[PDB]
Design a protein around this ligand. Sequence first.
Ligand SMILES: [Zn+2]
Ligand SMILES: [Zn+2]
Ligand SMILES: [Zn+2]
Lengths: 15, 100, 1189
Amino acid sequence: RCYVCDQQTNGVFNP
Amino acid sequence: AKHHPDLIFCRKQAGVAIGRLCEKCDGKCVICDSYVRPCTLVRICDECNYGSYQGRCVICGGPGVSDAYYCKECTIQEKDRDGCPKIVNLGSSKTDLFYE
Amino acid sequence: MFLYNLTLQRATGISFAIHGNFSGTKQQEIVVSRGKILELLRPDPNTGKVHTLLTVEVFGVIRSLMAFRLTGGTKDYIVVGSDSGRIVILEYQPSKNMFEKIHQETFGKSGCRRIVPGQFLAVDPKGRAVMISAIEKQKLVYILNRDAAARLTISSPLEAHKANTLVYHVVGVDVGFENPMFACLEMDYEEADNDPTGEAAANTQQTLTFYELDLGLNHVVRKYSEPLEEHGNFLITVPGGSDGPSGVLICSENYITYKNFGDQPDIRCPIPRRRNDLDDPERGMIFVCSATHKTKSMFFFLAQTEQGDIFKITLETDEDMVTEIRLKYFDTVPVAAAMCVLKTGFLFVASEFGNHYLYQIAHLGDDDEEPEFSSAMPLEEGDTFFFQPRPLKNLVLVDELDSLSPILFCQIADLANEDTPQLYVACGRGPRSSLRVLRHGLEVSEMAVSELPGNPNAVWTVRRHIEDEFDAYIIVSFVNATLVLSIGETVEEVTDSGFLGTTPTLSCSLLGDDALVQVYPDGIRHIRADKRVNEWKTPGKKTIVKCAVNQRQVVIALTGGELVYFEMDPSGQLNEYTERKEMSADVVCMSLANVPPGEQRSRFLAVGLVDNTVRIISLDPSDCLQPLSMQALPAQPESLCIVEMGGFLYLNIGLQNGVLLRTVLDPVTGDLSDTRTRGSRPVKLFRVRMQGQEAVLAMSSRSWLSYSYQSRFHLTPLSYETLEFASGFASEQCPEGIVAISTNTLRILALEKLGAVFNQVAFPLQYTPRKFVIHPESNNLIIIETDHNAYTEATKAQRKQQMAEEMVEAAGEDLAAEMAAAFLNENLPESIFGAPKAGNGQWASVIRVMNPIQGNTLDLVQLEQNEAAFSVAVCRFSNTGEDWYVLVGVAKDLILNPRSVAGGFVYTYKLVNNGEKLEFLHKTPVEEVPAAIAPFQGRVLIGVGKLLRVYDLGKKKLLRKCENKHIANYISGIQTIGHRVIVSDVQESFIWVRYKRNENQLIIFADDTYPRWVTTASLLDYDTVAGADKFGNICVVRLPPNTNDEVDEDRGLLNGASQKAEVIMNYHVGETVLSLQKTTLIPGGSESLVYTTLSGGIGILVPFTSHEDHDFFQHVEMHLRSEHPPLCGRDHLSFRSYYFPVKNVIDGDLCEQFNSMEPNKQKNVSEELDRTPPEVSKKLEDIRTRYAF
RNA sequence: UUAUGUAUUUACUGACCU
Ligand SMILES: [Zn+2]
Ligand SMILES: [Zn+2]
Ligand SMILES: [Zn+2]
């Protein structure tokens, strides 16, 4: 999960 | 109503005619007779909606303004699935007060 | 404590079935009611199968259902009358694929009452009025019209009240643009209840009554009222006006009668019984179905007696008046609730128990050979017109639609050593009964076999052109063999074909028109008719890794990475791009997919890397070899796939353990990775084509097909083994399919039943199977079969021999003893022609030991004539050693109404050797039917019925050791956790009983306050008991935290025990739950209570983990009761609180209709939830993913 | 000491009412 608010990235990562 | 115990309802088969309430009684439920949580429209029979009696108040018999409703507490008790709730007789109130 | 209902395989038994042009086209559709479910079925005429188009849960009981056509109309509206006090008229919108509720009118209080209408529903055949009527006192007529927007309108309900009046049926009398009339079989009973002499209620015959609606005077009047010299049960409309002699046929016991008022004399035709069928001591014969048909020349009726003998009733009238009616034995099918004969010549029968069928009508009319008789021929001495039953002549079976109703007993067991468990089900009533084994997979049926030696790695499927179906070749390689087999007959190893290149091959495809690309060590082939190969693939050295092909465009790699395209010319041969990236190595997989348009590149690249990463790159010539959006994966992908499945490009990676499903769109890539799991061997994802579209067969320890069936993404497994590879297939040997082997053989497969969830496999039985047990050593099923009104076959043989005796005795001088012998040796299949019915109080019963693998009768033990089994247990006693025993509770001369048993027995059997046979041991008597046997502490416990007795083996008979007599009305269930006994009364509830070791006592120490009518039960904790009842509910009774067991033994508390147990859920299901079992349906999942109802349905009750899940789904369904009301008007909170108020159960079948609203409603609910509708659908299918299927 | 029948105030109820 993320660093800012521990949101589920769910594998999704984009520019 | 619940307040005047001698008022009798019409209780015939509910048609397609939507009930109406006067300006003095807007927001009143018809059976439990309160103000909150209106959930179900009023359908009144064809004899109690004929000609001169169209758009007339369910309770007062005054000129109707808004549509009538049952509470949620009348709905979930299924007090809307009995007859039409058109109060028929005018008895012992707003008659002697007219004579006073 | 806090549970959640889900239906897995929803109900399949059909109560009502109607047909008509519901779509609005020329073709017709069936609308059936599964009781609580309302479904639309299309009888696909060219292929003959039956496809479901829609299935909604109305959350009521559809008490009656009938379609009507508006006057001068195309579409038929469905009309539903239910337990709500509501008539509701539905229209099937084909565009949005849902039932639009047209109107909904309230007329009385709800629930299946006696006074308010809803039970019987008749409609005028022209489509101008509709009458909805109760079983007593009151009827209603609505007047339907259409107003200027071509829109349906409903008047106020006309009233047809008649006090003290039963109604057996009601029907629409056809009068062609006249005042509509309705006919009904009434009965007035006030003098039947005023006279205590009893005979006044014995001569109180029915009345056919006609209600005529004066459209000019806007009220309903009793027009005609004529009595009946027998009791009719239901009526049939006769078409009239210009088409026929307008009236009503009246079906009755042993008669059919045309009555029509005014001038027609009453025409009687006695119903043809069979020749000498052995089911009648004294029993009459009624009809059960009508099935009118209007073939645009004449009209006929496919009536049906209660055995299944369809009759072709035709009215042949010389005047405008009727003259005489006549009928003949049309055919025989299993007994149906409803029939819908279809224009285009189909006949749909909905068997109320077992499977439904669709027949093609082969010889309609059938006016050629058969001995038909009539009404007005002077035949006397009773019926006197018989018929010999025969197999099919007029119908041919086309489709067998499947059903589990009635699920009588069920087990979750893993007897076949598979990973996932299995559902062992008892099913069916009568000779059509079956044990049915259900798995989670799909119907993987093999049509052809080959035996490919070595150890092949992979297979590919390729055609001549894009336009054919024969699929001219099929290539199979491991390291060095190409073996590109001919696909058709004589499939065997190939020489150098018209498409073959070299031996060590690694891929193939059709690139051009007939131009193939096949890839190997010196990879590039390009072969259409000439082997026009151009095999470069040498950047100095590297020549083998990672093919990834499409139909127009290629991307292949070498050791390295992002590399060559190697396209072609649209008028000519191959070429390349010399723009490379060369990508420090990191490659395990690549995959792509190509679009049906595209005069351009027209695809997207996805590559999977050795490092914990994948990568999507758009390789359009502007922005080529430039990465577009990034990744995340835990371990290694080993597989990739891109697919489109709807009518968003669904990126399916797979890693070596789990699989995903993204939602990559074409310019922008919002991925949204759906997750699921697959030993855990690395998965392999292979795009195949089913039903008209394509899907991914992702393969692992077991295979998994991930197909989008009406946009639902069924990720269902396969029933076969592991197969290690897959590819598509097409041939005329089998039209589509999957050739899918990397291990030592070769299989051509077909995935036939593709919509459903479970794999039915049936093992046929003789009678109604009550319950069965499981021999845990050397897993075998031990079934008791029992049927009231049925002969055991010793009496069948004796009755047949007796029939032969009186047929050769009744004046045989003049002769034919051929008739008796031919009668004796021609045995009709009772599953086909219906079992004979042995009067009353007779009871056939057998005991069957059966393999649950092959389903063969490993042992069969009949019983005597009235001695009926009711309870069975296998056990192992303590005083004797290891050896098994079988206890069978039997009753004798039971007669079941009014209930008068003649005392029962308990047979004891030994079950030698491995369990394959069953030796008699002894026969103990007992004075009331022992309906419950339960092993406990090396002994058994027998509920005699009000009497609970411990027992133990003796060599002469069973020996009691204790007894209790304070347990109430009648025992029906005994279950034990060890040191405690749960005694299920048949009327009150669960009664906790303690058994002592020092003494032998049976002390009642807790009961429940509610009367419940418990049918079955199951233990969940040491305290809690979940049970279910006859009416439909499910209760869970948890003992209070104190309830000390130590009670040694006069007042009770409320005429009962003292520690009153208490209830921690009540929930209504609408069907009688007959089997509750605590289990875990998927390994890696969790425990969930599994109920299998009586109407075929199968559901689960699932606990919630935390209060955030409970509170979330509670607010979800609390919003859905508002935004998405049920179809009948039946209020969902007051359907689930039907008998007892609901408690701590969230109806997830309302919740899983969040995925069925229009996205305006979905956005309203989701922002009212402060989530998004894909987030809610993820959160909502997580629970079904976790606990179940 | 429960209790009646009445003459009879005082309190209290019904979102009672122009
Ligand atoms: Zn109210
Ligand atoms: Zn009225
Ligand atoms: Zn008013």
